[PDB]
Design a protein around this ligand. Structure first.
Ligand SMILES: [Ca+2]
Lengths: 556, 556, 556
């Protein structure tokens, strides 16, 4: 009895699942620690009440079950580490990529990949019917409408963190939670539902909910997703330092539109320092309104009368994101008044950026080899009146057809770099207002060029140019300078030259027949023209006083 | 007695505060673990001696008290997790922002926000008297000079880490510590003092001290701050992966000048991969010398005779920082020989960057919609002789008045992008030395332009241009090229044209009266001029031998 | 007996090394936790069998020994925290940098730094003989061929994480492991071998192996290195969020060539969000093939017949890296089909980038003050046919000699910024295809310039220019525009002017003697020329029909 007093004071309290027949029995006994030291088969909907206790739950075995294992009434500060969820069912999965990591787009080829596995692919859903046209008819019935996920559901808790979670056909759901985090996810392999979900459709708007660190793979739908969360002006929530691989839908998704009877939208969240690779749909989908066939209202949210479709003041903090390998769109969003910075998107089959934004600013964007399968009309689309300050376009891929590279018809852009085809740029205004003294350095040509193109006149032909051309060969120390203008849709049709053939003179073009009065523009100027009937040059002169006179300029 | 032997060997040692009347009694009993499992009211200055033991302190309740709870004599490798500090006093706080997140600047409006709360605002300090002019007179006495903070003080320890700390009116102070870290701060809400402080005014210069991860909110002064730390050439200290929200002063601060009798300055620290949002003063304040009314000496530091004011070899490693929403300056520093990269600052009421630097290099800087309240003279200021390589300016905001955008009178700059008003650029030298072949693409105009502006001549008017203008309408296949020069402060006053009205000729300007001898510049050139008394063009000719002759060029 | 039942259920299981004579005895007794609470002297090769148990190993003391302490048969999910390795031997180390952090390059100066210490320098190896020419002869024998490292070796384990490791002369080796991580390394000071190594020369290719977070210092060779790892298309492995300081070789290394009888190469790894400072050799060395004296084959890898040397499809995910202070190369790699983004390299004595790549894309690269000791031929080298989209060159350093800045003879580049000497650019093609309307703003000169340079003609002289020059002084409201061409290797030798001396006319250069027929280029143009024998200007006219006629243009 003496020792027991001492022992109760000097040892750390932990209960372990191997000592109990059910998880509730263990939860009930727990005071400080709880060790999961044996695999536990749960039934879908099995619910554990943790009594408001602040528990440190250390997992060293699996939770095995189809459906949801529901944790409730955990005290603020509770932590669950090392959790591993696994389904009982091994479903049919598709694997729409080759052994050289090329995407498969042909429905029949995708069907041929079918296998029963808990990983290395995903269970088809209805969105696959759109993504792979014709697949709905070709999929066997046993591969359609599957619904396998083993989900850890944290329900109506505050201040709970799940650390280093993993699994097979695994999901993690925080339902009606606040100040909860999914930290350092240890590459769970996903199932039918989203891998990591913060859903706050009921109760107060979600706040304080983050994905921090870690990564996921596979899954039928999006890797990380938010419904009805608002981080406040403090931006207390979102996703930082995360990697998503091969989402069956999108890497990171803020939901759009109405779900159930209320809004699924999100405000004031962080999306930073993260990477999405090889999503079947999109890298980041940060829109809040439905694009195609939209609702006429926003129950639970701002009405259309206050903010039109795609013009919500979403106010997310969006910075330093990387997307590679999307089969859909690399980076998509909507909203009004947005600031977005430092986005890098490479090698996507659909548009690199699809931006249904207005009065927003995009700084230091790089869109490098996207729309490679011509799925969309362009590589970067912007609908509304926005500003782009720094835009890198084109890597090493060519474009065979007529699609635009940037179509941002209401936007003002500066700072494009890359080997863009200028005919594939469409913006409201493009300008470099603040360059210093300039040099055009030409490699691999016998000339250097400074060209001008007026898109209203022609998007495909330069309207004038300033050239420098070698006279003779390399090392001659001689070039000629040429000032040109387009005529009859023939670039460089008319030109003045300086030093052609090292002659040290200006070659001046003249009107090839009698110049009309209106040909001359300015006072105190002359326009030479040809009088064939005398073999003479004449000059149409607009005198300093504005009156016209015709003079003889050169004679036989 | 048999079991007790076995039990002492097989169980983890931890003591818990619920078994002791004081925190010292628990600390004294501890061997391995210490669990804080009941709220503990401490008195200011209460000091716990941990006996040099390497303890793992796990907090699941609050430390409650105004003033400092002082931890001493923790062994290297000790860890304190989940600590939650809370004041006993609920002070008066101000909230100088609206329900639409607009800053309040009017003192009377700020006073009207007063409430008693431990969060959602901050206790006024003397710096508020400057920030909100007139507020000193308008604040009620009960809202002035408050001093509420509940501070965990780690004193004279080596190798101690505080993880996942939080609180209300909370602070964390490492005094005279080395190799200590504040890791994954769980959004403590601050009090009167700095939220996270590494202060090494006594003893050896601080080294090995970091803030890694996490975030803070509110507080009256700066969120994270350093005094008398030097990371060594190894750069072993600083701040990485951190977020500061709504600092009452600045997000991240390295102190300047003398504090007490010695230097508060800092060297060789990292500031990387971090974000500061909505500080009342500055985002990052990385200066070491006092700007306004400076000391004539640096006791404990390099003398002015060795390094002039603002020219210390601070040698911080500064990269990948984001600031949004400052009411003061987004990014400020001083020093000589600095390299700074990848800084992004958006939507600040004062200057985006205030750089009292010399012989320093700034690479890939973006300053986007700053000085929005005209608090400073410019958006980015640089005092000394520096280099800027890549500078994005202007988002979507206009500027109504005469303030400069960049004033860097001793600096050489290249790579500006954005819709900057060129009259608002002031630098020593601006150049694009290494561009390739160029094309100017014009949208929304009937012409394209390549303009030249000599700032010594005029900062507001272009001095010459190369234009291409549509002849007729869209699709004509015809344009004219125009080479212009300014005269009488009228841009484009004098010009030569090629292909005006699709005439296929050059329109050449001539001197409107008798040309003086000195009007012609080069040998083997001619200058046409008007002789009104005969209705003739003449030519002032400088012959190949340099001598002048006047010839008749065109006659009736 | 009643209490013992209760106690066995309610307390956390942990054994502690203080209760056992050997580490194996403790490992054998362990069930859940294992506490290292006394220093433990191990013998090189001492091997601990952990029985497949999933153990949480908490270290609060040192493992002391030269050689390897080998951990085997740890269960998936095992974690080792706070480990501290220390050698028994204090070796001789060199410190090739000064008290102002300047690199020492002179062998005799390096030898003079010799001291016996476990840190603050490194043990020489054979690579130092190359790095510091002559040092092999000058080093005393007792400083050559040393081999001191205290290494924690995790052998043939899956799912083991080492967290917050540190030490003196310390190394960490994961041999034949999968799904293992080195997390938040707490600045171990290195020994003779690599600090952190994932080596998978035997068994399956390594996968799931990461360095996440943390930092290292010193060491004789590379800080973090990989052999025979392949992350799969999922990119499940690599290095994220890491800092390396003063590697004796390189910060981060993927091995090249054959080691033993098989490939040491690596595929599909992440290298992101990391920093390397002051390596003696390279920052990042991400090559897979041997550059100098290469193997004729790749046992265990793709044959040369399939992929030529330096053209392996390495497919690493490489983004957001910073290198400063290398004595060798900042960033090096090889491979074909690579995408690389957001690399920043500053202040390196050798090349900033050495890129033996083909059909690869580099986006937003900044190479700022590199090759400062002229160790290589250039600041950035690219061998193969690649694309660079955004390249910042030049900080504040000058270059005295003739070395190139970029030599990328097969690459197409766009978006250079900085005060580059254009004669030091060599590329296949350089272009800005997508600029908007342009303005050249000139500061500190009486003129503004838009220059053209044809590198085939001359890399050192501009071939033509468009200038604007002040007439009179500041505020005159007058400038002249000038269009020039090079002749006899004299820039600006021949020119046309508009508004010289505010004359409002064009000054036109003429051929200084009788123009040859071939001097005129285009039909409907004239070329003025001088007839000295009559003091007349003539015109060589190519009529609209293409035939030549000579006319009198101006007469006495
Ligand atoms: Ca004549």
């Amino acid at each position: 009895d003496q020792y027991s007093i001492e022992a109760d004071k000097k040892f750390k309290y932990s209960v372990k699942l191997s000592d109990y027949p059910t998880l509730q029995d263990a939860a009930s006994a727990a005071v400080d620690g709880l060790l999961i030291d044996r695999d536990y088969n749960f039934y879908g909907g099995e619910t554990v009440d943790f009594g408001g206790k602040v528990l440190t739950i250390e997992c060293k075995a699996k939770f095995i079950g189809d459906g949801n294992l529901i944790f409730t009434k955990l005290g603020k500060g509770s932590r669950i580490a090392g959790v591993f969820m696994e389904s009982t069912t091994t479903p049919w999965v598709i694997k729409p990529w080759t052994d050289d990591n090329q995407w498969l787009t042909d429905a029949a080829a995708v069907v041929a990949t079918l296998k029963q596995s808990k990983t290395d692919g995903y269970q088809p859903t209805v969105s696959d019917y759109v993504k792979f046209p014709g697949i709905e008819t070709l999929l066997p019935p046993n591969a359609k409408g599957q619904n396998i996920t083993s989900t850890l559901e944290i329900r109506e808790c505050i201040g709970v963190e799940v650390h280093r979670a993993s699994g097979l056909m695994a999901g993690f759901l925080f339902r009606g939670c606040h100040f909860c985090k999914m930290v350092d996810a240890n590459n769970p392999s996903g199932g039918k539902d989203g891998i990591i979900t913060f859903e706050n459709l009921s109760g107060d708007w979600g706040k304080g909910n983050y994905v921090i660190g870690g990564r996921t793979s596979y899954g039928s739908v999006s890797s990380a997703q938010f419904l009805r969360n608002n981080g406040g002006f403090e931006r207390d929530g979102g996703l930082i330092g995360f990697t998503s691989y091969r989402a069956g839908e999108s890497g990171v998704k803020t939901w759009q539109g109405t779900v159930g009877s209320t809004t699924s939208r999100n405000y004031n969240l962080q999306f930073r320092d993260s990477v999405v690779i090889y999503p079947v749909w999109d890298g980041f989908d940060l829109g809040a309104d439905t694009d195609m066939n939209p609702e006429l209202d926003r129950p639970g949210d701002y009405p259309i009368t206050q903010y039109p479709l795609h013009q919500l003041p979403l106010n997310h903090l969006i910075d330093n994101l990387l997307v590679r390998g999307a089969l859909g769109v690399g980076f998509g969003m909507d909203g009004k008044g947005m600031y977005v910075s430092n986005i890098t998107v490479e090698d996507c089959a659909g548009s690199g950026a699809y931006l249904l934004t207005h009065e927003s600013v995009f700084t230091n964007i790089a869109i490098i080899d996207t729309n490679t399968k011509d799925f969309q009309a362009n590589q970067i689309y912007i609908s509304g009146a926005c500003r782009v300050n720094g835009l890198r376009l084109i890597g090493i891929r060519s474009t065979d057809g007529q699609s635009l590279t940037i179509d941002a018809p209401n936007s003002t852009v500066s700072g494009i770099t890359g080997m863009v085809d200028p005919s594939r740029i469409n913006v409201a205004n493009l300008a470099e207002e603040g360059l210093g003294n300039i040099r055009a350095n030409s490699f691999g040509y016998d000339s250097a060029a400074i060209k001008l193109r007026i898109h209203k006149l022609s998007k495909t032909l330069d309207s004038g140019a300033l050239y420098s051309h070698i006279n003779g060969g390399a090392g001659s120390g001689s070039a000629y300078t040429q000032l040109t203008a387009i005529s009859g849709s023939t670039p460089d049709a008319v030109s003045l030259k300086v030093n052609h053939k090292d002659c040290r003179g200006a070659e001046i073009p003249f009107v090839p027949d009698i110049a009309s009065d209106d040909f001359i523009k300015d006072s105190s100027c002359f326009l030479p023209y040809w009088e064939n009937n005398s073999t003479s040059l004449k000059a149409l002169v607009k005198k300093p006083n504005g009156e016209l006179v015709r003079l003889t300029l050169a004679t036989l």
